[PDB]
Design a protein around this ligand. Structure first.
Ligand SMILES: CCc1c[nH]c2ncnc(NC[C@@](C)(O)C(C)C)c12
Length: 167
């Protein structure tokens, strides 16, 4: 039993809700919140900009130190950093950014990072400003992630479309 509330159950291990991941994380304080990161951990917009804003820019400060030490992530890769006031940990996961021309096959590799964590609060990878089809992102999520994932979808219209078209 966990503290996630109001989710619809899609499969044995995947759940979904129309919710702002920022407000959801502040309420649940999950062990792991997933950030829709880029390889430079420059949290400018989309989910990343919103999560970072909620940390009063502390996420960005931590991230800049991480990059200065380690260099950029790989597309499809991830790193675990602090969750600040939102979660115990933030798993920064880099899905491909279609608006940069990055291979969509890397979306599966990106979701594989979720399997290192027993429970996660997460956005759909590569959705929104990363330019991928969210219906496809949900399909890859369900077919790749084996751990318990709680997907927060900001747009109510998109949430309804995702539920109604799920196979
Ligand atoms: C600023 C973006 C954002 C803030 N809080 C969020 N929580 C969840 N998802 C988000 N964006 C991705 C998306 C695919 O769900 C959306 C575009 C329908 C956000």
């Amino acid at each position: 039993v966990n503290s996630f509330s109001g989710y619809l159950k899609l499969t044995d291990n995947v759940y979904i809700k129309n919710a702002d991941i920022v407000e959801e994380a502040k309420k649940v304080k999950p062990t792991v919140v997933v950030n829709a990161a880029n390889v430079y951990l420059k949290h400018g917009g989309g989910v990343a900009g919103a999560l970072n804003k909620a940390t009063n820019n502390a996420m960005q400060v931590e991230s800049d130190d991480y990059i200065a030490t380690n260099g950029p992530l790989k597309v499809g890769g991830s790193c675990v950093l602090s969750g600040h006031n939102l979660a115990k940990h933030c798993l920064h996961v880099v899905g491909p950014n279609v608006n940069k021309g990055e291979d969509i096959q890397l979306l599966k590799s990106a979701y594989e990072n979720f399997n290192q964590h027993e429970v996660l609060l997460a956005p759909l990878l590569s959705a929104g400003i990363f330019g991928a089809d969210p219906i496809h992102s949900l399909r890859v999520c369900v077919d790749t992630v084996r751990t318990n994932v709680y997907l927060a979808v900001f747009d109510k219209n998109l949430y309804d479309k995702l539920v109604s078209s799920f196979l």
